A paper describes a structure:
Inosine-5′-monophosphate dehydrogenase (IMPDH) catalyzes the rate-limiting oxidation of IMP to xanthosine 5′-monophosphate (XMP) in the pathway of guanine nucleotide synthesis and is thus a key player in the regulation of the intracellular purine nucleotide pools of almost every organism. Although mammalian cells synthesize purine nucleotides de novo, T. brucei is auxotrophic for purines and critically depends on salvage mechanisms, including the IMPDH-catalyzed reaction, to acquire these nucleotides from the extracellular environment. Recent evidences indicate that the activity of the catalytic domain of IMPDH is allosterically controlled by a nucleotide-mediated regulatory switch. Combining recombinant in cellulo protein crystallization and serial femtosecond crystallography (SFX), we here present the structure of IMPDH from Trypanosoma brucei.
In cellulo grown crystals of TbIMPDH isolated from baculovirus-infected Sf9 insect cells diffracted up to 2.80 Å resolution, exploiting the 40-fs X-ray pulses of the X-ray free-electron laser (XFEL) Linac Coherent Light Source (LCLS) at the CXI beamline. The crystals belonged to the space group P4 21 2 containing two TbIMPDH monomers in the asymmetric unit (ASU), corresponding to ~75% solvent in the crystal lattice. Extra electron density was identified in two clefts on the surface of the Bateman domain that were unambiguously assigned to one ATP molecule and one GMP molecule. However, instead of GDP or GTP, GMP occupies the second canonical site in TbIMPDH, exhibiting a flipped, so far unknown nucleotide coordination mode for Bateman domains. This enables the formation of direct interactions with the catalytic domain, resulting in a stabilization of the compact IMPDH oligomer conformation. As a consequence of the observed flipped binding mode, an interaction of the two bound nucleotides in the canonical sites via Mg2+ ions, coordinating two ATPs, as described by Labesse et al. and Buey et al. for A. gossypii and P. aeruginosa IMPDHs, is prevented. If guanine nucleotides bind to the second canonical site of the Bateman domain, a more closed angle was previously reported (e.g. 125° in AgIMPDH-GDP1/GDP2/GDP3), compared to the corresponding ATP complexes (e.g. 155° in AgIMPDH-ATP1/ATP2). This is confirmed for TbIMPDH-ATP1/GMP2, exhibiting a bending angle of ~115°. However, the TbIMPDH structure clearly reveals guanine nucleotide specificity for the second canonical site in a quasi-physiological environment of the enzyme.
Numbering used by the authors:
A (entry chain B): 3 to 103
B (entry chain B): 439 to 494
C (entry chain B): 3 to 320, 331 to 404, 439 to 494
D (entry chain A): 3 to 319, 333 to 404, 439 to 494
Write the structure that this text describes.
Amino acid sequence: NTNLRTKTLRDGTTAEELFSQDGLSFNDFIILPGFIDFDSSKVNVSGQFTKNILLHLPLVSSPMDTVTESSMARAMALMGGIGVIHNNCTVEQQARMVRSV
Amino acid sequence: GAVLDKGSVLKLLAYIHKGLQQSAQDIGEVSFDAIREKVYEGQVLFNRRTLTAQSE
Amino acid sequence: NTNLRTKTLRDGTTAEELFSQDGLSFNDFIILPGFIDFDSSKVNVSGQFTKNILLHLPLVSSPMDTVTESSMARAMALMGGIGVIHNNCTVEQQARMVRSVKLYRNGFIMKPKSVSPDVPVSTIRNIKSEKGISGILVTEGGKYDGKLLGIVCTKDIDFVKDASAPVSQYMTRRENMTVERYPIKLEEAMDVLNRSRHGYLPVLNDKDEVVCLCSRRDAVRARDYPNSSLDRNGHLLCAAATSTREADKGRVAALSEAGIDVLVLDSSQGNTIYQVSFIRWVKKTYPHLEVVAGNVVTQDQAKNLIDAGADSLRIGMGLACGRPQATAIYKVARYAASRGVPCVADGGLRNVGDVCKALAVGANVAMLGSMIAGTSETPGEYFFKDGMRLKGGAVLDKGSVLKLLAYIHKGLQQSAQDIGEVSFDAIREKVYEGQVLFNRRTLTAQSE
Amino acid sequence: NTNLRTKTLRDGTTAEELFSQDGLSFNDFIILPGFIDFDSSKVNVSGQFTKNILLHLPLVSSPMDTVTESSMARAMALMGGIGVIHNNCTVEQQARMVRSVKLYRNGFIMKPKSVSPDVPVSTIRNIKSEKGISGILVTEGGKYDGKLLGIVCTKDIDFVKDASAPVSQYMTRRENMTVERYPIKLEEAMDVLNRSRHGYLPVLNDKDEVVCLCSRRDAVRARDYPNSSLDRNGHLLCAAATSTREADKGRVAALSEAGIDVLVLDSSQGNTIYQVSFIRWVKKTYPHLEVVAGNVVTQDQAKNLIDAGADSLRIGMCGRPQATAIYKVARYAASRGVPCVADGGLRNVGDVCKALAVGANVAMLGSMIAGTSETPGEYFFKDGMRLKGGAVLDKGSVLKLLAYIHKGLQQSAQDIGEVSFDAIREKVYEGQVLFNRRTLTAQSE
Ligand SMILES: Nc1ncnc2c1ncn2[C@@H]1O[C@H](COP(=O)(O)OP(=O)(O)OP(=O)(O)O)[C@@H](O)[C@H]1O
Ligand SMILES: Nc1ncnc2c1ncn2[C@@H]1O[C@H](COP(=O)(O)OP(=O)(O)OP(=O)(O)O)[C@@H](O)[C@H]1O
Ligand SMILES: Nc1nc2c(ncn2[C@@H]2O[C@H](COP(=O)(O)O)[C@@H](O)[C@H]2O)c(=O)[nH]1
Ligand SMILES: Nc1nc2c(ncn2[C@@H]2O[C@H](COP(=O)(O)O)[C@@H](O)[C@H]2O)c(=O)[nH]1
């Protein structure tokens, strides 16, 4: 299907051009649609958290004392993402939370 | 310093997950690795919206 | 007057230049005035719905379950536009609605509604409430092509109290009826029916069997609505929507039998292998049907669907705030125009100003959704709340769509007059030519 | 079911007690529920407009030029209410409007619209477009009582291309017409008409001159609108407004001759010598007319106008609170056999019900029906809204709206536990229908 998927007319702004001026918000632009020959269930959303770690789910929980402790970090990793235990606590507390995950 | 209950994060993650897939489907690539690549390649394209185009 | 009309100074932005940057809304710009040497009444607002269909009125009703069913589709076609029957219903229901639009206006009525003499008066009173017709023929066996016994009309049964009485008791019987013999020209049949001062004229063969029927209503409809959108057979035009699943192949056949003229593909993004496969299949299997592909918003999408053989394209949305409709329409319509394919503007039309802009920047016709919801001819039940009359997720009553269409119509003419061209075909041409010019408005210029 | 319907515990406030203090709006109280042993459809909402006129539908269209000209008055009367032709117009205009209402529905149409054979089709199309009538008779010299030559109907001229042609060519000639001979009882002529499958039946004298006419349309309107408000001649009822100046004595004569059944006095405050005098004059001069005095808001005003010979009173018009005003004035006037019209403060069906329950026989609608199809003015568009022209939204046909208010009153009466509003009014005074005042906190949901 490469003939149908690849653009020749290329009607739209390229990213290099889009960001070549003002500082933009996400609201300042939209992504133009392409060509579909597959069910959305087959889409691979994975991404590299780090050079050697690939998250199946490109989601990381923020390291805030109101969001990520042992319980959240567990949930994130189970779903394919990861958690970052906040550092607003004693060294003993934070390590206790890591062991717990 | 108070926020609404949003249920289990497990349900919320699966909702985000399903949302990413529908969006990447709209763009027309079967992975975000490919979307990133083709953004740089100039095959995935954008449109800047005017401010009044953003109000509708 | 060409010397006075054609611009040399050309003070204003060209369209190619206007849309060369940001994605624009219709509000982001205005069309600069031209030169006027004609009354607005003479303006030709027509546009191509598809390659072979030209709408006198560049208006299409949206295929939503809240806007277009049989009643609306009738109204649109009568005024010179067209309707697209929504696809949120069984195949049987949707086809029932198509037949209902096609057979509303006839030349010769081929399968006239018939009943037997046994049938009670009550039954005929139900037919005028449901189908909306009279002049029901009473034939042998109820067969629509049986021996003609009589005819039932309004003044025959309005005074009757016992609704159980057979029709034979109150019908006008064959001996007293004025009929005609087949074959006869339609031109003559209607002159006979007119001079006859009756509302109906059966046409029979040698054995007094019913061949067809003429209605005087189809004479006045031809008179009160001289711009109606008709097919070769004098029947109103009717489009219908459909998805592009394999299952929907069966739905297309049904609609084809019911006699739609245009197939509108229903998709929020039509640049799919499915839609492409589907279009190819329709054109191969049903060559007589024109197909409106979509929705699309880019030239790249548009290329694929025109390749597959689309006769038209829907531009717009209908996740997800997408490509600004003004830009989308300009870009796609221009591309498609080169491939000889017209475009339908489908989204972002809040008022008449917007519709005019959408047609000037390249759309041949505009699809109306919200702008006509709440009119008499839309599906829904009327009700009251807080002294307001509503329809049903509830909208205000807007009277008959027929009045509203004529208001849009008059509005397009005044606008095209301001621009200074006697047709929207010419405005589109001269937009591309760089003779009709625009001005982008600043945001504060838009606040006054 | 008396042992169930009659209250002995009597948990609630009587009206006499409820209105014994400060002036109440309709929102200040509610009517406590009763006992139900009947379907709502069986409820009789009728009320006395004047002493001798009982409206099936206790609703009157206001005499405002925004609301009631000829078209509205018809619609009201057909549904069982009545219209009051406004007076912001010439005497000539106002009587012309009255005639349109009276001569709309007939039994026998006297003075049929008739034309000469020389007249072009163009004229028949204009009579059809303006006055809305068809079945135009063709007679000698166009005299409504001339020798009958033919009849012109829609199917005779809808197909004609040359609008200047004389009706003679396309009319149905007297030779081919089904007629009848005078005298003939109406109910028999209407039977011939139904049997003939025609839309019109002229009745002639011995010399083939037109005495009167029968319209099949009038037979459908008796079938479709069985509760139409009619006089003793089968015409729709019609009221018209007038002020009480000397100048207006002329106006009353014109309106009386046009055929009004009820005169409605237009005054911001009716307790004036001018109205007292005027009422006496109308009664000495035109005793066949019922008069509606007002507006008034106190018993003291009511006495003077009732003394003068009023047959009804407008209650309303910043001022005295309307719920109190209706109660205080209506109770007094009831004791003297005079019914009252509620004219003010009616924003919804709920208000209407309360107004009628606390003593008004009929209500006068103004704003609540402004913007309906039948009100004067033209429609126009703006901002995706349909409007009339100071502007109001399209409310559709008033006929649908009136049926809504009707069913609304029936539902309300059912909750209160009585099968008629006469009953409710009676039992309010008797203390068997009870209310409850509401705190301002209890009003805010
Ligand atoms: N072809 C015909 N020949 C003779 N009489 C007819 C014919 N068609 C209808 N009629 C009679 O004419 C009378 C009604 O006339 P007409 O058909 O003009 O009424 P109409 O208002 O057009 O009916 P509808 O409103 O139901 O269409 C009836 O008695 C009917 O039987
Ligand atoms: N009294 C009559 N005798 C004979 N023919 C009549 C009579 N009245 C009307 N007609 C004829 O009937 C035809 C018109 O149809 P009809 O009378 O059934 O009602 P109509 O045309 O629907 O009435 P309207 O003009 O109010 O619409 C014409 O040909 C007319 O000449
Ligand atoms: N007798 C009669 N039949 C009509 C008229 N108009 C349409 N028809 C026919 O009535 C049929 C519609 O009824 P259905 O088939 O839906 O029961 C179609 O065959 C249509 O052509 C009319 O005015 N009179
Ligand atoms: N021919 C005819 N006359 C009517 C009909 N209905 C009312 N009229 C009469 O037409 C006349 C109209 O009065 P005008 O408006 O001309 O003063 C009145 O005499 C009225 O009674 C109708 O259906 N046909």
